């Protein structure tokens, strides 16, 4: 089994309610334990951010995040603003950086 614990993240100057009709909960919604980070208004520049979490507990933690590959470059600049996007993830023994590959999938 699994026990969940709040990461305790706090967002300012963006939208944290990105949802979809493919995840129905009395209308559109998203993953329960994730949040779809959106720009504060369509096509607006996404402010560069940095958030951090410490594992205080005695057993290791399962951290899961998502890189979003939008349908089109146009949609990508609609949700997160224009320009190149980059997401870097850091820990004591892990440092990878992801670039979204937008494009059409079936």
């Amino acid at each position, epitope marked *: 089994g699994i026990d969940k614990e709040a990461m305790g993240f706090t967002y300012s100057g963006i939208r944290t309610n990105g*949802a*979809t009709s493919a995840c129905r909960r009395s*209308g*559109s919604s998203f993953y329960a334990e994730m949040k779809w980070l959106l720009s504060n208004t*369509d*096509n607006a520049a996404f402010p560069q951010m940095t958030k951090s979490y410490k594992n205080t507990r005695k057993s290791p933690a399962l951290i899961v995040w998502g890189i979003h590959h939008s349908v089109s470059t146009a*949609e990508q600049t*609609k949700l997160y603003g224009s320009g190149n996007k980059l997401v870097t993830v850091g820990s004591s023994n892990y440092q990878q950086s992801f670039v979204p590959s937008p494009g*059409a999938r079936p």
Partner: antibody
Amino acid sequence: LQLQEWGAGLLKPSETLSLTCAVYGGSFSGYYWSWIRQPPGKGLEWIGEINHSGGTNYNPSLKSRVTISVDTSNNQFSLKLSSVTAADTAVYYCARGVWEGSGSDNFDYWGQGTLVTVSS
Amino acid sequence: ALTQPPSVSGAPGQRVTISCTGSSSNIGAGFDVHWYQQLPGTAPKLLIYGNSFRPSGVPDRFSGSKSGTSASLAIAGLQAEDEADYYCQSYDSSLSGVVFGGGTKLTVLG
């Protein structure tokens, strides 16, 4: 799912068009809630939308002139257009928009429509 | 920025096509195009969404598509009750919002 909007009819230029639309059979926060207008001759224009949280999505060409509020309690959402010209004479609809990413993707269950003639 | 023809003819039954021509910023991106049926004096109703998917109430007749920078609706099986105005709709990033077409007027015999 019922959808019917009421408010001001005739108003003269430089006034403030105010409308308000009521819903029956559904609930906010599942979708977006949009106002879409249609001039009497031709066309169809999306003026803006809002969600339960008060999160708006406004048409940039009508920003600084439009404000959409939401009465989460009374199952109705409003419309404020602020310095009305004669170009604003049109039919005004309210409609529910399917929330897909950022703001809505298509519109299901449109309202009925009210005419707003703005002439002097 | 969705250029539709203003008029389409048609005898009952015969298939008839409605163009929805758009630019590289609305349908020349991943934005789906949908359609809406406005019967005279009434509100619009939702026709085809997701470029082909029809909702509950729409007959086999109504069939749509999207290709390159444009879409095309097809009314095969023209009944009398299809007299209405049809609009397409998608998302334009240059306007940062949702756009409709001018509209096409569906006229039947006799």
